[PDB]
């Protein structure tokens, strides 16, 4: 999925924000790998 | 010059903020968010 600038905390285990409660939660003893990264010239386009 | 103010007799819903909340910085000692809206606070000092 994609995620805003400032929501880099959100998506991790344990804590609290809009995006987990609401859109993409994690167990509290969950196992795996998190990677993140910018595609400002990927996904963005003139006019938004 | 740090701004010092005293609150009390009222009502504090956390969530309301999160209705156009822009908060990059966030942090918690002693006390977790989830509970803010389960307790009562004696003394409420808040600093800017």
């Given at each position: 999925f994609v995620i805003r600038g400032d929501e880099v905390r959100q998506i991790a285990p344990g804590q609290t924000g809009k995006i987990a409660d609401y859109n993409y939660k994690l167990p509290d003893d969950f196992t795996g790998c998190v990677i993140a990264w910018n595609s400002n010239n990927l996904d963005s386009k003139v006019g938004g | 010059a740090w701004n010092r103010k005293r609150i009390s007799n009222c009502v504090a819903d956390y969530?309301?903020?999160?209705?156009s909340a822009s908060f990059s910085t966030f942090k918690c000692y002693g006390v977790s968010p989830t509970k803010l809206n389960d307790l009562c606070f004696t003394n409420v000092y808040a600093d800017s």
């Open positions: - | 969530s309301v903020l999160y209705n």
